[PDB]
Amino acid sequence: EINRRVQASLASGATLEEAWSAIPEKLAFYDYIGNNPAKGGLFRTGPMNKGDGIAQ
Amino acid sequence: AELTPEVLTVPLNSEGKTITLTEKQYLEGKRLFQYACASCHVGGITKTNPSLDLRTETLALATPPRDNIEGLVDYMKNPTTYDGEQEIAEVHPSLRSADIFPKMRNLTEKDLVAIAGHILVEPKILGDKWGGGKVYY
Amino acid sequence: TLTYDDIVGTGLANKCPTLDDTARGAYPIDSSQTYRIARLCLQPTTFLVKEEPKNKRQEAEFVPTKLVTRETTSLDQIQGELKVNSDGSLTFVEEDGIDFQPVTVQMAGGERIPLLFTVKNLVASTQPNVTSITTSTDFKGEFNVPSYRTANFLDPKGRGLASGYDSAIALPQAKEEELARANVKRFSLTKGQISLNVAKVDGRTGEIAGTFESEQLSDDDMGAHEPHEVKIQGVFYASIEPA
Amino acid sequence: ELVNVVDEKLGTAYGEKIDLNNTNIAAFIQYRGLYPTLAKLIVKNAPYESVEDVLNIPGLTERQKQILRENLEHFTVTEVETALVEGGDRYNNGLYK
Amino acid sequence: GMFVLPFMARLGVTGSWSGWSITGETGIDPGFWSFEGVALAHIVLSGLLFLAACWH
Ligand code: CLA
Ligand code: HEM
Ligand SMILES: CC1=C(/C=C/C(C)=C/C=C/C(C)=C/C=C/C=C(C)/C=C/C=C(C)/C=C/C2=C(C)CCCC2(C)C)C(C)(C)CCC1
Ligand SMILES: CCCCCCCS[C@@H]1O[C@H](CO)[C@@H](O)[C@H](O)[C@H]1O
Numbered sequence: 355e356i357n358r359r360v361q362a363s364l365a366s367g368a369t370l371e372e373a374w375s376a377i378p379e380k381l382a383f384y385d386y387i388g389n390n391p392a393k394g395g396l397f398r399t400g401p402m403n404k405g406d407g408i409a410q
Numbered sequence: 411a412e413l414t415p416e417v418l419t420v421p422l423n424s425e426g427k428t429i430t431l432t433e434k435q436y437l438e439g440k441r442l443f444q445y446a447c448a449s450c451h452v453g454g455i456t457k458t459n460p461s462l463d464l465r466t467e468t469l470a471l472a473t474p475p476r477d478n479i480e481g482l483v484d485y486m487k488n489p490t491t492y493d494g495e496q497e498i499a500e501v502h503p504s505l506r507s508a509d510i511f512p513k514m515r516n517l518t519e520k521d522l523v524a525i526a527g528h529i530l531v532e533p534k535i536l537g538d539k540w541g542g543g544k545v546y547y
Numbered sequence: 548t549l550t551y552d553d554i555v556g557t558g559l560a561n562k563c564p565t566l567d568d569t570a571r572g573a574y575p576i577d578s579s580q581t582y583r584i585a586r587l588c589l590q591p592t593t594f595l596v597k598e599e600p601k602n603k604r605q606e607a608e609f610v611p612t613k614l615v616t617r618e619t620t621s622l623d624q625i626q627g628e629l630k631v632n633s634d635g636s637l638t639f640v641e642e643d644g645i646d647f648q649p650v651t652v653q654m655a656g657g658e659r660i661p662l663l664f665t666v667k668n669l670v671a672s673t674q675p676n677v678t679s680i681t682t683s684t685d686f687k688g689e690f691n692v693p694s695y696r697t698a699n700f701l702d703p704k705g706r707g708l709a710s711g712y713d714s715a716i717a718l719p720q721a722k723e724e725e726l727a728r729a730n731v732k733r734f735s736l737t738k739g740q741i742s743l744n745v746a747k748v749d750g751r752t753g754e755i756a757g758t759f760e761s762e763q764l765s766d767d768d769m770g771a772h773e774p775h776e777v778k779i780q781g782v783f784y785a786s787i788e789p790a
Numbered sequence: 791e792l793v794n795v796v797d798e799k800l801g802t803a804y805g806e807k808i809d810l811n812n813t814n815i816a817a818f819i820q821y822r823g824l825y826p827t828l829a830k831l832i833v834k835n836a837p838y839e840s841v842e843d844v845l846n847i848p849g850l851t852e853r854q855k856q857i858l859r860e861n862l863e864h865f866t867v868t869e870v871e872t873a874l875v876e877g878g879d880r881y882n883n884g885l886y887k
Numbered sequence: 888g889m890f891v892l893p894f895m896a897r898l899g900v901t902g903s904w905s906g907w908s909i910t911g912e913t914g915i916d917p918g919f920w921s922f923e924g925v926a927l928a929h930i931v932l933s934g935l936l937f938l939a940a941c942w943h
């Protein structure tokens with residue numbers, strides 16, 4: 355989906371920086387393996403923030 | 411895929427002449443190579459010196475060239491170091507040293523040719539597996 | 548004339564040859580003749596480690612340690628050139644030999660100190676005007692101390708210098724900075740110093756023996772921590788020969 | 791500041807050619823006629839201030855000099871890296887197949 | 888925060904099997920009656936008193 359949006363942006367005449375800056379942080383954050391539920395541990399307890407941290 | 415006459419066609423000499431081995435020749439080659447050579451050269455490597463392998467490119471950069479039938483037959487008669495500088499029959503199986511490497515004793519010219527042919531054909535079949543070692547198993 | 552079967556398992560193999568108490572002679576040096584040390588042997592008898600005080604302004608001492616890697620400590624079969632210099636001094640230039648041993652000694656309280664006990668690339672000279680090697684001759688010099696582990700060595704998490712991971716893979720999203728010193732392996736190369744005090748001389752056979760003291764750094768675990776200072780004391784044997 | 795010296799050296803000519811001053815001897819198998827005779831001489835008489843200095847190894851036959859000249863283009867020299875030359879690693883660097 | 892260590896030292900147990908002493912010496916041989924030896928002794932004594940308790 356991200357690539358689709360970026361390509362739509364470029365085709366509309368945006369610059370690379372512009373096209374990628376138009377991508378919502380929320381969307382990008384979904385495209386990150388630290389939010390994949392199949393990356394955990396049985397005794398790795400608590401919130402995801404306790405692992406890779408609080409995303410800023 | 412098949413073991414075709416084309417697969418079985420290998421360089422005879424450095425001058426661009428080829429020779430086309432029969433399937434019986436190929437089988438004889440595998441048998442003889444296992445018989446007299448595989449203990450060290452299984453899969454196209456060299457257990458007692460892994461720096462040197464039996465890949466065609468390697469043989470081609472050897473001195474004299476060993477990427478053809480004549481070169482390999484000669485090597486099995488009078489093996490040299492990679493640069494051709496030293497004769498090493500005293501520590502490497504050859505007809506010249508069949509007295510100290512007794513499995514070389516019943517090997518005929520025909521046999522040396524079959525072994526040579528095996529060494530040249532096998533990488534045409536196995537590609538990087540040949541001389542690749544465990545990475546490619 | 549002992550055989551390998553006389554010696555095996557006794558511990559004698561880690562001992563340097565001795566000279567009789569009669570060996571108090573002089574070995575003449577022909578300044579026109581070239582010479583070689585055919586065999587240099589160094590047998591360590593004590594390993595001292597300099598304690599590391601807390602105020603950093605105290606007089607730090609070398610304390611005894613307990614050897615835990617058994618009779619595996621001696622340097623031997625060392626050979627090299629013995630130059631006769633212009634001023635009459637002699638200079639031994641080490642060429643080759645079994646000239647290193649990893650050694651682990653233990654301090655009081657249990658801290659273990661590994662080191663590469665060595666005289667690699669030893670260059671050592673006497674005083675000027677040595678017309679004969681005598682019980683007054685001494686050699687003083689320097690040697691190299693390379694990393695205790697060489698470049699391929701992998702730590703327990705598989706990190707190394709010339710091979711291995713370059714990061715802490717078990718902590719995929721940890722911050723790198725705090726782990727830099729453990730992640731980036733470094734190869735130390737420092738200098739050591741040694742004195743040989745000749746105590747015995749067979750001027751007939753060209754054999755000499757005596758005591759030595761060497762000083763050098765210990766293992767730094769490929770840059771993960773600071774090395775300790777080590778002082779090694781023992782006996783040595785050398786056979787001098789016209790080359 | 792902390793640097794892996796081998797990775798760093800890979801960004802120099804050492805990562806492009808046979809470093810007469812550092813590279814493990816098996817590398818001389820890459821090119822016709824260098825291994826083992828010339829390779830042993832070259833490693834033995836290292837280090838060299840420039841590549842063509844390899845020609846000054848005492849005892850070299852004319853053929854040997856010709857082969858060396860033919861292969862200078864595949865050679866380089868960089869500063870001796872302790873980590874690559876200690877432990878007799880130039881003769882055996884722990885790599886086989 | 889050492890509580891029994893000073894009582895051992897008071898009556899003459901000052902060394903460890905590991906080679907140190909509380910007076911800061913090195914390479915001392917405390918014999919069996921190191922701090923560890925004293926501890927071991929007490930543990931064993933405890934065991935034996937437990938068995939005797941059962942019997943009585
Ligand atoms: C439906 C059950 C359920 C689920 C899916 C969750 C899910 C969650 N809880 Mg919640 N919670 C629950 C019930 C549940 N909870 C209950 C009942 C309580 C009251 C105790 C709590 C109190 C609670 C607190 C205080 C916290 C959470 C937190 C969390 C989050 C972290 C989970 C974690 O680290 O577990 C780890 C899971 C394990 C380590 C697995 C344990 C496996 C057991 C020990 C095995 C037992 C073996 C057994 C003895 C064998 C017997 C053999 C015999 C038959 C022979 C996660 C979203 C944390 C959080 O992030 O909050 C914001 C947090 O702090 N929960
Ligand atoms: C069996 C008869 C046999 C053959 C055939 C054979 C071939 C062979 C070749 C062609 C080379 C050169 C490789 C190159 O790239 O140039 C070569 C080299 C070595 N071999 Fe061999 N070899 C045969 C038998 C054996 C056996 C049984 C052993 C093990 C004892 C062995 C080992 C070696 C070694 C070592 C080398 C390298 C020699 C050097 O260049 O210094 N071979 N072989
Ligand atoms: C002299 C000395 C000393 C001291 C000592 C002591 C102090 C001792 C003690 C001792 C003791 C203290 C002992 C004890 C013993 C005990 C016992 C011997 C017991 C037994 C028991 C029993 C037998 C029981 C049984 C049972 C059970 C268990 C269960 C139930 C049932 C019945 C009852 C059967 C010292 C060291 C200083 C040193 C010097 C010398
Ligand atoms: C054969 C070289 C001319 C004589 C040199 C000294 C003999 S050396 C000779 O080398 C042969 C391999 O060439 C071996 O078959 C034989 O066992 C070995 O003793």
Ligand SMILES: CCCCCCCS[C@@H]1O[C@H](CO)[C@@H](O)[C@H](O)[C@H]1O
Pocket residue numbers: 656657658903904905923924926927
């Ligand atoms: C009852 C006996 C229990 C076993 C005693 C443990 C070993 S003794 C132990 O050794 C450590 C390492 O040398 C020291 O650091 C420590 O001071 C010492 O008490």
Ligand SMILES: CCCCCCCS[C@@H]1O[C@H](CO)[C@@H](O)[C@H](O)[C@H]1O
Pocket residue numbers: 916917918919920
């Ligand atoms: C149940 C464990 C028994 C172990 C005994 C070890 C004794 S060790 C022995 O003991 C003497 C008395 O302390 C010392 O004087 C002596 O120096 C020491 O070597």
Ligand SMILES: CCCCCCCS[C@@H]1O[C@H](CO)[C@@H](O)[C@H](O)[C@H]1O
Pocket residue numbers: 904905916917918919920
């Ligand atoms: C129940 C088995 C426990 C046995 C432990 C015996 C320790 S015995 C103890 O050991 C010290 C060295 O560590 C010596 O300095 C000392 O002389 C000796 O008594």
Ligand SMILES: [Ca+2]
Pocket residue numbers: 682683684744745746
């Ligand atoms: Ca003296």
Ligand SMILES: [Cl-]
Pocket residue numbers: none
């Ligand atoms: Cl290769």
